[PDB]
């Protein structure tokens, strides 16, 4: 079959001048982040539950209402768990569904159950609902470059359900969204009417976003077929940096060091990587010292981090989109 | 209810009178089937090849043309072969897709793959294309009743693509489409909303047609729990007899002899009745004396066993479904 | 390299005359069964339920008034389910637990669970309540030939929980307790302190009752390894018949005709099989009529069919243990 | 052009004529093969036994000392037991090895593990020397007829170690010698420098002898790929019978009665079957009374019953290979 | 609620002051521990042999000799190896049986399995009698206070039988005694009469000691959620050797360096830590100079490095468990 | 089964003189090594390309042509791809070949399968042309020596085909050759006649060369049981820096450095892991900046990085073999 699915090895990113790395840091709010995408997700979301569906719904809804034509697929499935049958839904947005290539965006949207301990609730603000609100914080910075679109290339971004153990952490209860939906992708022909290849190879990269917004986090190099991507983090960081744009941050603890982790972390990412697509894996170690607890909520996050991230983040897509 | 998923169990027909089946037998023609639904199916259609597409074109069209409201699926999927990655698709119809329960009737609609030997083109006429015809034929003649739908159970038609083997019969080179819809079944819930149960648990009981075609067809009785539904196509068979409604047929060459084989054939149903679907399996023993050759063709049918078919069939379907 | 799990190869039965055929014939109570054994356990017993419990009080109590040496195990374990994790509790009862080899009469004593169909409340009469009651009728029976016991052979009895699906019948929803202790035998060494050797290998034969009480039961023959032992329960019946100690039984429909049936019902035996486990398997074909019905009480036993197989069975096992 | 795999299902044989019939028949000698092939077989032989290397050296020295042009290979492998790691050697003995196709014969040549019960040795003589002799006396009998090999096919024999098992019947303890070498010739390149073939594709049908030599064996149609070539066997016994060049033989007792079956029975076919070869499965159903004790021994052989049935066989094999 | 399971996620220790910590540090005598706890150990004992019944009994009686309440259970089970089938026994040391939840520490009791090289014996004496010492020499030292337990939460103590390969390390051959229990456990409702959780998840913390004795450890932090307790020993390694507490001890070389090792050492936690236990895995990186030679022996080991290792153990399971 | 397989272990090294410490650097050329070895094997060469028969046969003329006399197979075999099957072949080369033990150098030699980027044509210097000469001059500048063999320990040399994945990494697609020669292997008697021991456990310690020939190489310490040959690694280079035979080589800028690293890394070592051979796996982290570009030819090769590693290599590999 035609070997499109080689072009994603030789890809080379568009860099930005100065001038145009100022452009960005003004173009993104954190506090327009923290009011309209943030705080209506601080709620109990564990999957079956209404805060499942009032998550999907403000998600769906803050989306909709940009002008860039975004495709939205609800993709929902049952599987078993240690109580029982279980309906999950992934959330999936896309730009130019027909492309063959798309760089993707991903978190989880599901918060794990816990009954009421100490009569507070679990609500997992770096885990996962930051993550969801930067991805929703870049749709709208860049819905202007991102309309230029009505090298075969466009965006994506992924919410999956059922990161969590229900109960404990074993392959047969966790990971529900991501196993299901690679497999899936696997098995569907791309583009319309392919007869040799599939959605998946159709990935470019998949970064994955989890437990982010604690103070000083540090984010190792996981893996080699990915390595020349991260260090381009790395130099976004460096520069912006320079050039004072952002905040209270230093260069003697950099948020993307240069220290290869090893092993891996098990996450959403598995069933992909498996399958041979890469993956920038943007989890910190050590994990938050909040690390499901009740105490991972709004007042232990850190407003400064979360924008630098958010400014870096937002230079990547863009140059990785030669837009 | 949570619940319902038990009552196939205690489901029991609608038997017909004397005036009524007369009028039935008389509401179908065989030569009707064969010129419009069969011979436009006598055509080479393995998977991936232009008469597979035109297969498909003509069984959607032939549907599409009725008054009852059915409901068209294209389920297209990716898989690997011993020649490399292919694409299949089967086909579903459905009436009033939102009845938690469906009875279902099947067949394939691929032919095998061959070269051309001897200067001849292997079209399956029993294997499987009278199947198809006879499907397409019996939604035709009870279109009238059918569409009085618009005891909560409607019907559903599926074709398959991909039976059978393109090199050697294994478990990974076969029952490719069949393989694909049972796993997509059992991980969808049913009825829409729906958080315990799935498609597969609304399937009140598969009725798999194969290898038909061929004169004094005899049809053993394979499974001990869907033995009760076909002591009723006995008892059909044994009622046009006698009151004179069935051709060229005796009561010494019947086709459903109370027999016992009492072992198992590889098929389309294999993958639905390892997850507990009931089964009625209509495929002979032995198989049609021109099994795989060159010769099983137009020529080689017998017009009279298949109108007979026919009548028993679409008795048994209206009795099932108490119209 | 040891050794006797051989010996059960080679063995041979020590047949009885007319007048012991007599005696056996007139020891057997099928109005103190009725009465003693089968009717307490006509009722909702499903995995978990209070009536489940009651059942295992009952077979433990009856057990226990004989003066032979039983020894009573409960086997206690926790799975996973459709519905979540569940307790169940198989029964073992072992005459002489030291001995090398044991011959095993076996049953499962659960009841299928139903919602209340019309009020009503399956209690599955021939599934399995009466094999319950025939294999504590044969412990009391015999209870004078057996507290001889104190060849290194003996007896045992086996009542298995979940054997039922809860939901739809899959490998992972079926065969709850024997998928569990086939594991555990298997896994155990016997005889005590033995080295080499397994409780599983200490199976002399498999002796499965399932689905029995209805009146014209025909029993098959499965497997060629165990032919010969079915064998000589046909000319037990045939003998037993020509002495007049069978009641409304007649040699032109007897119970164990021979016919070869070919393949497998899937049933409690199927984790020991694939083990090499010898397997008798007194599992009628067809089913009875009122199958996974409400109609599968009390009032559609046949009495006399059950007393008859009563006689055969207890001449077969003084047989094969010498006695 | 390869391609060629589909060429065993268009094969049909050429027909033998009532003098050549009387030919073959006074061609073969029950007495020479008694004395010179059978004989020295009936020893101890489970496998690393003396007797293991003495028997696969009698069998190559018969072979070696015909005329035809035999190619002799020995399959040394290791693997895993009851008793631990342990080694096995088939005899693969072949005519035309660069052939694409051959149509096989086969058995196994180990005996099966004991311990001297009764202070006896067990032989198996039905199971398998009679099987091994009569495929030496049938490489004699036809010596000069192969000779002149020199469509694209040519006959292949094999005698397979470790059918039995050792300790108890499962799918790791049985049919050590065909799970290899079946997985060996799926994974082998045939023809010659081949890119897309292998050696399991080039076995035209696979003729299984096992459990031969007592007196009135009846012979199931398993499969229904091979049986048009069931039904040729049942024909030559007729023929053969009808021109009096049979003993002691009944039309009434004929071998292959056309009855099925079933299921299946497991044997050294399954692990070729299973991967989509074709097998005319030579196994009686039911096993001769002998079966696994140590009385299956010379004495309760039947002399006719192997004579009748070696002249059918070199009868159905002159007629695959049109010679 | 049927919930409990999560408790341990959410336990904090209870932090002794430094009189208590003098207390500790004057409570344990190494040599005592050398004397009757460790040179008895320092025998051949690979399972099945004599040395390996001799080391059961030797920590069975000095538990057995200790005022608080050990209840003291033996499970013994078969298995296949290299060799053949084997029978193999842990040993499970509990207090409070009943209660719901246990800290756990374990360590492996058998010695690797060699031929005298040189005329000399294989003892493991890191690998692992020392590990197996400091455990008796820990339940002695804490007895008054471990009598206390008579929070639903106790101590419990583990000695795996069969850890290494007895001829090469394969997922057959290795973890023998821990792959049986972890399985034994996850099917064992917990606490008695529990309807939906296990043994299993009664484990609240798998402290597993392996290869120490060595001088100049470096012990890893392998897993991110049972980091917040490795940063414990490092608290209490640094305020014992402030307090004077330590011998022959530097800051520059402590024992727990907070460096993190992302590669996973296969080792008896991992039967454990797939079905979700929480893990602190004490093994050090690298291993031993001595690691599988004949100089692990008694002259290799250091005495200061094992004294201090005590007294930070000690401190922490007072800590665990706020005695 | 004898105890040989434990020879591995105990074995030491017989370490070198700073004089024949010299008459190794001098005794190698790195110019001859270019020409001769390295240039004809820079072309396209992935599975069944002409290219990848005459790197076979490149490979096998330059060992056919030394003194020693090496022992030559060639492993041919069928799998399964992405594209259909195809046919592959191992190049095996070895020293002594019925000797108990063999230490085992190796690397793959096809080239990855690529569409013709910008004219350009992947060639794969480092990935793996470079490891394939490497080996060729250690035979040749080792040859006079080597031939002193004719401690039951010699040499092997493995060049494996169908490393590359053809479309997507995933176990099914990568490592045909590695998984198919591990598995053969295993199950080969060794030595000849033995009864208990393969072929596997000869392989004292499988040293993988791979991505090698690019400046400033950082190889880290990957498995515990391995560690001690890579100190030598690290000790064997330091003295070779310190005696000035080491060109463009600084000590900062070491090669082995003491790095410990996760581990895996997929690769040819995968498949002998899982089965217990102790493995030196000499890869570098990062990887070297042109990996799978089309930049990975001739020109960005550095000669003294190269010279350097053939001088520590072939010292290695004298001390393991105490020549
Ligand atoms: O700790 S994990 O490696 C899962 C695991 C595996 C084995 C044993 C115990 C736990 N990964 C993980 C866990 C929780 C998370 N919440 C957000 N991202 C998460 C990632
Ligand atoms: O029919 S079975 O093969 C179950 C089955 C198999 C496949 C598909 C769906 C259902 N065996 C069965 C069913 C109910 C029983 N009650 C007592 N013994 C029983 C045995
Ligand atoms: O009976 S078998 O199906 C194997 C089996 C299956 C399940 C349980 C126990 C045994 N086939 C068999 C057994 C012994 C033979 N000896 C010669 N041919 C033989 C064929
Ligand atoms: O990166 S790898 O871990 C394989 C992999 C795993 C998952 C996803 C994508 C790729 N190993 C690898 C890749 C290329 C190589 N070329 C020479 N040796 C190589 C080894
Ligand atoms: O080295 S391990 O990772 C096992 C292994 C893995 C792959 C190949 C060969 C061996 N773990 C191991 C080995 C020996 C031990 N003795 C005490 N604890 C031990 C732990
Ligand atoms: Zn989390
Ligand atoms: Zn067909
Ligand atoms: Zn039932
Ligand atoms: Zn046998
Ligand atoms: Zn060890
Ligand atoms: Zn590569």
Redesign the interface.
Same mark, same amino acid.
């Given at each position: 079959?035609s070997?499109w &699915?080689?072009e994603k090895? @030789?890809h080379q990113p568009a860099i930005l001048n100065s001038s145009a790395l100022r452009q960005i840091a003004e173009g993104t709010s954190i506090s327009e982040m923290w009011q309209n995408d943030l705080q209506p997700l601080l709620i109990e979301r564990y999957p079956?539950s209404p805060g499942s569906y009032a998550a999907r719904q403000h998600i769906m809804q803050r989306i909709q209402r940009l002008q860039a034509d975004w495709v939205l697929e609800i993709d929902?499935?049952?599987?078993?768990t &240690?109580?029982? @049958?279980?309906?999950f839904s992934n959330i999936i947005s896309t730009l130019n569904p027909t492309a063959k290539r798309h760089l993707v965006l991903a978190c989880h949207y599901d918060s794990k159950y816990?009954?009421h =301990?100490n009569n507070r609730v679990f609500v997992g603000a770096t885990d996962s609902a930051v993550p969801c609100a930067m991805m929703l914080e870049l749709a709208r910075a860049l819905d202007k470059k991102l309309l230029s679109l009505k090298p075969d290339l466009s965006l994506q971004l992924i919410f999956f359900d059922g990161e969590e153990?229900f109960? +404990? =952490?074993? &392959?047969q209860?966790s990971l529900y969204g991501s196993r299901?939906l690679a497999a899936k992708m696997?098995?569907? &022909?791309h583009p319309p009417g392919?007869?040799?290849?599939?959605q998946?190879?159709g990935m470019d990269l998949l970064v994955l976003l989890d437990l982010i917004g604690a103070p000083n986090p540090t984010f190792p190099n996981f893996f080699?077929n990915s390595?020349?991507w991260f260090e381009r983090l790395q130099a976004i960081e460096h520069e912006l940096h320079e050039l004072g744009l952002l905040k209270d941050h230093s260069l003697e603890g950099r948020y993307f060091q240069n220290y290869? @982790?090893?092993?891996?972390?098990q996450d959403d990412h598995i069933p992909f990587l498996?399958?041979?697509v890469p993956v920038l894996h943007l989890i910190p170690?050590?994990?938050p010292e909040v =690390? +499901?607890?009740m105490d991972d909520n709004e007042e232990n996050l850190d407003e400064s981090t979360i924008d630098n991230l958010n400014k870096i983040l937002q230079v990547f897509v863009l140059e990785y989109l030669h837009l």
């Open positions: 079959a070997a &699915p080689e090895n @030789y079956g929902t499935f049952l599987s078993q &240690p109580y029982g @049958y279980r309906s816990f009954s =301990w153990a109960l +404990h =952490w074993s &392959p209860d299901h696997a098995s569907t &022909p392919a007869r040799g290849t599939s998946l190879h080699p390595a020349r290869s @982790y090893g092993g891996v972390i498996r399958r041979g170690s050590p994990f =690390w +499901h607890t």
